[PDB]
């Protein structure tokens, strides 16, 4: 689903065209809610698109059977990747975005502002147009992809310091020589009842991530009127296992044992400030 364009004349010189497009994968429990803000600026001969990427990405977590006796496992949402990408020989660049710096605050919050004549400023916290991002990521860290460039921006939102009661912090690769990975281990019952209480797991590991990310695409008004972009939401599911060995409970964490990847493709009509869904692509890996 795609809203019609709504139009806000900010003054004689700036018009905003907004459309919100929604693309869902019911199979993966991912829902992309994209808000496209075209900024028409009569003093600047580039189109500006502020694209806000929101919605939700299910963690992939399911509660274990409480009757698992000697051995039990859970999958959890250990990393979320978002990318917004342009094409190599179109004349559209990714010129700015938010967030930009590595960030482990409980809430990521940024404000983007567009200044008349075409300048973008990004600041911390909640100009002719403004937009904000705000997302909770407790126990996770957001890192800008090292492969961000003029055709592509990406972020990884990844398990960083997970506290287990007053124990930890644990991560995806924690290893104790005896207990293995203790991330979600209650006590060193049935295996199925020896994971820590769900409410003590980070919300991103057991429920949904609600991403909010901004990017700024600049389009030259010479050459083509239309271009394509893609937006990818992805989860890495880690397999977290607990096992009685004879003497004690030990845990093991296998990174990215399942991957789920939803890519949508949109045609951008820069002359008319409209977008059209061209494609959705669900891929999965299962180690």
């Amino acid at each position: 689903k795609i809203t019609p364009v709504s139009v806000k004349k900010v003054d004689d010189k700036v018009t905003l065209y907004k459309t919100t497009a929604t693309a869902d994968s019911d199979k993966f429990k991912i829902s992309q809610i994209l808000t496209f803000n075209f900024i028409k600026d009569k003093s600047y001969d580039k189109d500006t698109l502020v694209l806000k990427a929101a919605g939700n990405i299910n963690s992939g977590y399911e509660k274990p059977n409480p009757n698992d006796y000697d051995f039990s496992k859970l999958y959890w949402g250990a990393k979320y990747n978002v990318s917004i990408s342009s094409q190599s020989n179109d004349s559209v660049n990714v010129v700015d975005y938010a967030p930009k710096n590595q960030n482990e605050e409980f809430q990521v919050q940024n404000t983007l502002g567009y200044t008349f004549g075409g300048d973008i400023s990004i600041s911390n916290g909640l100009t002719a147009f403004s937009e904000t991002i705000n997302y909770k990521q407790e126990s996770y860290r957001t890192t800008l992809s090292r492969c961000t460039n003029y055709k592509n921006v990406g972020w990884g939102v990844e398990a960083h310091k997970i506290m287990n009661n007053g124990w930890g912090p644990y991560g995806r690769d924690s290893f104790h020589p005896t207990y293995g990975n203790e991330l979600f281990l209650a006590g060193r019952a049935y295996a199925g009842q020896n994971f820590i209480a769900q409410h003590q797991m980070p919300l991103l590991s057991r429920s949904n991530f609600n991403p909010e990310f901004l990017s700024v695409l600049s389009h030259r008004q010479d050459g083509a009127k239309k271009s394509k972009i893609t937006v990818t939401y992805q989860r890495e599911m880690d397999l977290y296992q607990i096992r009685w060995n004879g003497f004690y409970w030990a845990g093991a964490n296998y990174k990215n044992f399942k991957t789920r990847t939803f890519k949508s493709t949109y045609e951008i009509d820069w002359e008319n400030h409209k977008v059209k869904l061209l494609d959705t692509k669900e891929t999965e890996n299962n180690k």
Partner: protein
């Protein structure tokens, strides 16, 4: 005839390189073999640094991409680009028709219609592409510095990029950003294809390697008048190799290692 699509995304943090690969299985009853069309994308950072030892600019002379196998299970049957090409815009297309018929075109526009197709597109301004080796077991491309536009200069000019120093800092001994092309200032977005064929029933699994990286040169400027030297192949083969296992029977592609 159907297409089973997979992807693999892997990042080397050390090298600042991303392999975003697409793996498309062509499953065709009118066709003797399995085919896997592999599209290689992602990003290889330029890793252009300006330091003191005398300022040094280290910079990517060549980008490397290759796919190789050691198995007798599997052969490469096509690759794109197929031939040397020097235009800034490289846009090409592979096509497949029912019956085991692959053709390619050196363009996207005007390239005809197929049951299935896959395109490549990349920009390589001031660079040129060479297909340094194709055999039935591997292919290697190099995207090599060629010639630069100045306020026009070969990639082998020793004084390339050096500047009467605009300041005391190392970066001030080398031309500004708006004078460097994306492949120096930012990096390379690769877009390459190779098809893997496997005689149906001749083994369930096969293995192959994809490598991305770069060869760095080094330019050295200082005022003694500006003097400028140049080390070609300063740091060669700054590369990441990713080994994949393909399962023909279940149409799956797994990562085995990243070096």
């Amino acid at each position: 005839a159907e297409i089973i699509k997979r992807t693999q995304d892997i990042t080397s943090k050390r090298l600042a390189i991303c392999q975003n690969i697409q793996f498309d299985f062509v499953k065709d009853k009118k066709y003797n073999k399995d085919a896997l069309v592999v599209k290689m994308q992602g990003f290889i950072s330029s890793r252009t640094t300006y330091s003191d030892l005398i300022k040094r600019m280290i910079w990517p002379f060549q980008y490397n991409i290759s796919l190789k196998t050691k198995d007798s299970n599997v052969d490469l049957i096509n690759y794109l680009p197929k031939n040397k090409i020097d235009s800034a815009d490289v846009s090409q297309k592979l096509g497949y028709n029912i019956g085991g018929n692959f053709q390619s075109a050196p363009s996207i526009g005007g390239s005809g219609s197929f049951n299935y197709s896959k395109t490549i597109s990349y920009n390589q301004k001031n660079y040129v592409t060479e297909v340094e080796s194709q055999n039935s077991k591997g292919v290697k491309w190099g995207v090599k510095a060629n010639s630069f536009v100045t306020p026009q200069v070969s990639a082998y000019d020793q004084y390339l990029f050096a500047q009467d120093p605009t300041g005391p800092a190392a970066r001030d001994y080398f031309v500004p950003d708006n004078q460097l092309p994306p492949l120096i200032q930012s990096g390379f977005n690769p877009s390459f294809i190779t098809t893997l064929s496997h005689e149906k029933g001749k083994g369930d699994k096969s293995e192959f390697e994809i490598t991305y990286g770069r060869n760095m040169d080094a330019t050295y400027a200082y005022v003694t008048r500006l003097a400028v030297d140049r080390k070609h192949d300063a740091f060669k083969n700054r590369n990441v190799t990713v080994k994949y296992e393909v399962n023909w029977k279940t149409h799956e592609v797994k990562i085995k290692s990243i070096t």
